[PDB]
Ligand binder design. Structure first.
Ligand code: PX2
Ligand code: PX2
Lengths: 365, 365
């Protein structure tokens, strides 16, 4: 019952988003290739009980997006070497006291530098730095059994990363650039539906996830339609804030939807028809820009503000001749409708920055 | 230069927040005790090159808050056993094909169940389940060298967790309940400062982080002032949303601060004095509730709405006799001030739910 229903919902999510099955199958295939290689090409126990670092490196350095693998791994690459670099300094350097004090001070400094301000996301390298240094110190005591146990833990962790890179980079690439288009376009549609729902309701009564993907996207090679290196992936994040202004405005509109001083609807149903036209014509420019961005038409947004500007102006010179319903429990309701409509003209006025911010991007791209 | 300045800023942050130094020192002490114990009580190499699981368990199962350690570890506890539980089923169970198909299907199902909906936070147990099963399968091939290499990797990982629990639970406990008070009180003050800044500006011209802590807090024992088990840690999160309503309102106020249709200030400086009194008297009830929550006075919020209600009503019957500035480029500005003031009365009206939601909590506590 519950299991079947959950599986069904997951199935619709998977067919809607086919990346889930592909990514899971890719991880499965990488684990199978590593296990098969170990169990076939090494039946001779030169080393067959200390290779659990290959499975671990495969399961840890493999992520959803290609930019993630390349850029996040490079953080781990310098992170492992930095701890190793100081390790050689403190391996050659009466012995046990120095060992303990070093292993305590280095951990202290690493932890303090990892709990600092806005890097609470650049943190895997510091865990790497702690673990590498602790690993070297818990085992390097001998200098006779050093290399034999040390390189048997580096070669196998390197030839798990090689495969986890090749398989991920040459089977269904999940390029971070495309997901940026998917996020920047879905925003337009969902905001448009939000405005439509906002305006429909008074008459009905009887950049964290967008700039992180930019950091990933600066490392992925020019795929197909992204022509040259250093593609201007700086204006996709600047268009998002331009829309986020209007997102705040429509959020205020919804806060007006669910207010506690709502108007006496019989009174509101006098100025009741022009709002719908303003909303309908405002949704159109917002859907058309999304359509322009999705296929990336290099023809330009030529003067789309016309209909919405005319609608806004006609709304402006309609609130004014019929201003008898807005001014003089009872008094508070009157100004509410004025606050109600005064936001929408602000939406149209703010809609202009979006057009400029997309015209500059369509030229810079 | 840069290093000294960064260190200084970190020093002020640390003296302001002494938990950073304490937590880092505690991790350092745990690493030192583990390393000292290994290097002193085991100079005899029964096993001294395979205990790197003690250092790892210490560095991974140790977190900031006590509730984190106990509850997150329990997720790991059943996570490791669940994979181990099926492992015995698929160890007794012609051999290699079954091995590969099992290690692929189990990984597939675990990954799919980990990339599901709103658990993107309950995910460490699934990594644990993958790693345990892969570990067992990459090594259990022998059944003669099984136990010797297996228990030498369980005893040491258990007696790193024992110390990482004891040290964290009996040296400067960082109880999750107290941080809930700190977050629920800081909110009142910062929102009050936000309102004060909002109202000061038109005349100046010439629950993700609160409900997660609740889940942690349900596992920590009754410390001191929290009397009995099953303390009502359900109303601290319900008061936060009651304040979040007004947070949305003041966010709309700030959106009005930075609008593009701002009023011609010479015109606004006519109805200019009562807003300041309304804001000042509204900040007071908002600071006093924070003071009531901070020390948790069991005396009750007895009729604090009086001053703010009177201020709101006097504002109401002031917009109305002077309504000549609000109605009839020029027309749009007029209704702006009406939207301006119509929000504030909504703030006072919404302020009532907060008092009820805190009166019920002060009785239930
Ligand atoms: C060159 C490019 C490398 C690209 C990526 C290579 C590694 C990627 C790191 C991903 C996670 C990882 O491998 O862990 C580092 C391990 C210890 O971690 P764990 O296995 O305990 O989780 O620590 C170790 O593997 C031990 C190795 C320490 C010896 C390595 C340095 C030897 C001297 C190098 C100087 C050039
Ligand atoms: C009992 C309460 C325990 C409380 C916590 C104990 C462990 C806490 C887990 C924290 C992380 C951890 O230990 O990793 C699990 C390891 C493999 O992980 P890693 O060392 O590769 O990172 O996997 C292993 O350690 C291998 C152990 C597998 C044998 C354990 C099960 C044996 C049969 C148990 C049945 C009762």
């Amino acid at each position: 019952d519950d299991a079947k229903d959950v599986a069904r919902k997951a199935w619709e999510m998977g067919v809607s988003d086919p990346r889930k099955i592909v990514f899971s199958a890719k991880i499965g295939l990488a684990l199978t290739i590593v296990a098969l290689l170990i169990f076939y090409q090494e039946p001779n126990p030169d080393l067959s009980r200390y290779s659990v670092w290959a499975i671990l490196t495969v399961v840890v350095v493999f992520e959803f997006t290609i930019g993630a693998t390349l850029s996040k791994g490079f953080n781990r690459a310098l992170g492992t070497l930095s701890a190793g670099g100081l390790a050689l300094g403190m391996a050659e350097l009466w012995e046990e006291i120095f060992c303990t004090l070093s292993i305590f001070c280095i951990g202290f400094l690493a932890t303090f530098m990892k709990l600092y301000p806005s890097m609470k996301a650049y943190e895997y390298g510091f865990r790497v730095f702690l673990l590498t240094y602790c690993y070297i110190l818990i085992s390097g005591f001998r200098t006779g059994q050093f290399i034999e146990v040390a390189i048997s833990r580096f070669l196998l962790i390197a030839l798990g990363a090689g495969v986890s890179l090749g398989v991920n980079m040459f089977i269904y690439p999940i390029w971070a650039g495309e997901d940026l288009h998917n996020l920047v376009v879905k925003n337009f549609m969902n905001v448009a539906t939000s405005l439509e729902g906002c305006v429909n309701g008074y008459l009905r009564c009887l950049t964290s996830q967008e700039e992180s993907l930019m950091s990933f996207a600066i490392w992925e090679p020019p795929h197909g339609p992204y022509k040259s290196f250093n593609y201007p992936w700086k204006n996709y994040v600047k268009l998002s804030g331009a829309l986020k202004h209007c997102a705040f405005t429509v959020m205020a509109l919804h806060g007006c939807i669910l207010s506690e001083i709502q108007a006496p609807e019989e009174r509101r149903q006098v100025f009741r028809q022009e709002l719908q036209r303003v909303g309908v014509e405002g949704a159109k420019l917002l859907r058309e820009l999304g359509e322009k961005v999705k296929k990336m038409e290099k023809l330009g947004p030529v003067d789309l503000l016309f209909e919405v500007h005319l609608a806004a102006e006609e709304l402006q010179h309609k609130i004014d001749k019929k201003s008898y319903l807005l001014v003089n429990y009872e008094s508070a309701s009157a100004l509410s409708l004025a606050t109600f409509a005064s936001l929408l003209i602000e939406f149209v006025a703010r809609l202009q920055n979006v057009v400029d911010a997309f015209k500059e991007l369509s030229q810079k791209a």
